[PDB]
């Protein structure tokens, strides 16, 4: 079951997600990616019910890309977050609600890095770090303990690696590998997978 | 969630069990032992509902030991399996049923090695190999594919290790270590834990 994490530093946001797709008692894929690139400087990380997660993320992704094509420039992380929220909330009481939980990470030229948390109800919160999934219960306090607002990216990846080690130790599910990416002024960078 | 496995060769039975005690989303112990020594040449491996499992296994254990003290010699693996089954079946429709699944492994001076399977309903089957838990779904066919009745103990531990690797690869739960023991004419021998 699905784990998302984000940590925002002074000029970047780091994000990671597990790579498992499971079904019943089996992992069916171990290189699954739960991140969706919305624009040069925006990732949407999406977990929840099957079908809803991809349908929702891809719809958001295509509309963000459409906005870019229509206007010549991109939606800010904050605008995209609010766009995402409006869609989810507008569907909440409709015949087609989407059961998805999200993180939105981005870097804006003028606002700097941003990390947004959203639940399936479409409550939106800006946070210095955040996580979703049952794994969040075991890692949020690790983040509260060691995060600082000026944390460097070398130390953020170390902190991330304490969180992921804690899941190996203490979480009942087998989540042995994680996708890791960072966003800053120069866009989206793939880091090495963190594996056990 | 709990895994038990047994493989019987010509003159030994090999058994292994996971070492996790879990509660809700957390492993609370990673060196748990699910094996109970009934006599010099009998192990009972027990999983199922909390409380029931230990209360049942220890009641059996004490009674087997009492038999030894009363009579000067030990219950055969077969007799112990049947005793175990009588008790479980007798409780099945009572006010105090025990929700436990078992393997009984033993070596008898005159019948040789034996492996018995029992479910919570108290159906008793003798088997050349067997397993309990959701992990069984992913390992039984591995045993059907490679087991032969003359399998040597060196090859049995290898076959056990293919099963346990399959759980690391494919099972959704984090079971990283296993107790392993063998029983033969010289009693019960602890093997190294198999760990990941």
């Amino acid at each position: 079951m699905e784990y998302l994490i984000g940590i925002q530093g002074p000029d970047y946001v780091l994000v990671a997600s597990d790579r498992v797709a499971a079904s019943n008692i089996v992992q069916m894929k171990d290189d699954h990616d739960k991140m969706f690139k919305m624009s040069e400087k925006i990732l949407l990380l999406c977990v929840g019910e099957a079908g809803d997660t991809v349908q929702f993320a891809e719809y958001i992704q295509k509309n963000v890309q459409l906005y870019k094509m229509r206007n010549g420039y991109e939606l800010s992380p904050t605008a995209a977050a609010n766009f995402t929220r409006r869609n989810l909330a507008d569907c909440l009481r409709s015949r087609t609600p989407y059961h998805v939980n999200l993180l939105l990470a981005g870097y804006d030229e003028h606002e700097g890095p941003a990390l947004y948390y959203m639940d399936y109800l479409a409550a939106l919160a800006k946070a210095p770090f955040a996580a979703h999934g049952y794994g969040a219960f075991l890692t949020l306090s690790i983040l509260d303990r060691y995060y600082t607002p000026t944390i460097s990216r070398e130390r953020a990846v170390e902190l991330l690696r304490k969180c992921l080690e804690e899941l190996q130790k203490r979480f009942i599910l087998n989540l042995p590998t994680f996708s890791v990416r960072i966003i800053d002024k120069n866009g989206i960078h793939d880091l090495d997978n963190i594996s056990f | 969630m709990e895994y038990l496995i047994g493989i019987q060769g010509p003159d030994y039975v090999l058994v292994a069990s996971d070492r996790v005690a879990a509660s809700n989303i957390v492993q609370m112990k990673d060196d748990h032992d699910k094996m109970f020594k009934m006599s010099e040449k009998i192990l009972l491996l027990c999983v199922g509902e909390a409380g029931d499992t230990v209360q049942f296994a220890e009641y059996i254990q004490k009674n087997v030991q009492l038999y030894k003290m009363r009579n000067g010699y030990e219950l055969s693996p077969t007799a112990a399996a049947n005793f175990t089954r009588r008790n479980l079946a007798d409780c099945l429709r009572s006010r105090t049923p025990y929700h436990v699944n078992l393997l009984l492994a033993g070596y008898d001076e005159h019948e040789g090695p034996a492996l018995y399977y029992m479910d919570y309903l108290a159906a008793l089957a003798k088997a050349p190999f067997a397993a309990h838990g959701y992990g069984a779904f992913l390992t039984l066919s591995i045993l059907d594919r490679y087991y032969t009745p003359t399998i040597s103990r060196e090859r049995a531990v290898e076959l056990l290790r293919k099963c346990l690797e399959e759980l690391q690869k494919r099972f959704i739960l984090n079971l990283p270590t296993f107790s392993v023991r063998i029983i033969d004419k010289n009693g019960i021998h602890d093997l190294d834990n198999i760990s990941f």
Partner: protein, 123 residues
Amino acid sequence: SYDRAITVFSPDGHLFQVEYAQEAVKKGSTAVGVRGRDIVVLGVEKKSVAKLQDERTVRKICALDDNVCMAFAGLTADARIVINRARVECQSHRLTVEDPVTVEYITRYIASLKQRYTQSNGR
């Protein structure tokens, strides 16, 4: 069910059934125990001799658990009851305390069983 008071006081404070039970012990085969420095030994007389006897079947020294044994003198049938009761109790102890009994614990248990059979109706 039979509720007669069997063991009762007599005028000079005696419990005659108990004294008679002691007479039964005195006619049993001799038994001796000696506590060594790092050994303990039990030895006991006869039972019969009797060439046709299967010796194994009449031992008067009995394991109660792995770390405790006992000899007795007196009524052998009575002893078998006490021994079995003690054997059961050694397994409860291990069950609930996860240690073998001390010798004192099981001695105390046996003694208390014996005292009860001097103060209970019908026995």
